[PDB]
Amino acid sequence: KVFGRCELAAAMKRHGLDNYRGYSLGNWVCAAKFESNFNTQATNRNTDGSTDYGILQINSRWWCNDGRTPGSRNLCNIPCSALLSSDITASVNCAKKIVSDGNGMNAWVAWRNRCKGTDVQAWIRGCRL
C-alpha cells in the first residue's frame, strides 16, 4: 500500500507517535516519506547481510527476524514480514522501541539526511492534527 501523507499522519497519531520520546508527529511522517515513499512494502538490502523493511525501513540486524541476517537480536520479537503489512501497527510499535535507544531517530538514515532539524510541521500541513 502507498499511504497518503495525511492518511499516514492520522494513523501514526492514533498509535501514539506525536511527541514520542521528544519527536513531534511531523518527524515520523517525514521519515516515512523519505525512507519508503510511504510504501508499506519497501525493502532495502544492505551490505552487512541485513535488510530494511516496510514504511519505516526497520533493519533486520537488531529488530526483526528474517532468518538470513548475521548478528541477529530480533528485539521487537517479530518476523520481518510483519513490517511489510498494509496497516502500520507493527511498524509503529517496533519504532517505539527503536527510538527508545540512545540513538533516538538517528536510527533512520532518511530522517538523518532529509528531516533532522527541518520544518517538520510542514509534513502535517492541512491534516488538521
Residues tagged in the binding site annotation: 101
Contact, 32 vs 38, CB < 8 A? yes
Residue 26 contact among Cl ion, Na ion, none, beta carbon within 5 to 8 Å by kind:
Cl ion
> What are the cell numbers at 92?
509503529
- From the CB of 66, what's the least distance to Cl ion, in Å? 4
CA-nearest of 83, 32, 40, 34 to 62 is: 83
Of 7, 48, 52, 66, which one is the catalytic site residue? Answer: 52
State the maximum Cα–Cα separation within the chain, in Å, rounded to a whole number.
Answer: 43
Rounded to a whole number of angstroms, the minimum distance from the CB of residue 14 to Na ion is 23
Q: What does residue 5 show for φ and ψ, rounded to 5 degrees?
A: -60, -55
Nearest CA to 113 out of 24, 44, 52, 33 is that of 33
The residue from 36, 51, 59, 91 that contacts Cl ion (CB under 5 A) is 59
- Whether 52 is catalytic is yes
Query: Cα–Cα distance between 15 and 47 in angstroms, integer?
Result: 32
Binding partner selected for residue 52 from Na ion, Cl ion, none, CB under the kind-specific 5 to 8 Å limit = Na ion
Minimum distance from CB of 116 to Cl ion (Å)? 13
Q: Show the site string, 62-101: x = touches Cl ion by CB under 5 A, - = not.
A: ----x------------xxx--------------------
Looking at the annotation, which residues are catalytic?
A: 35, 52
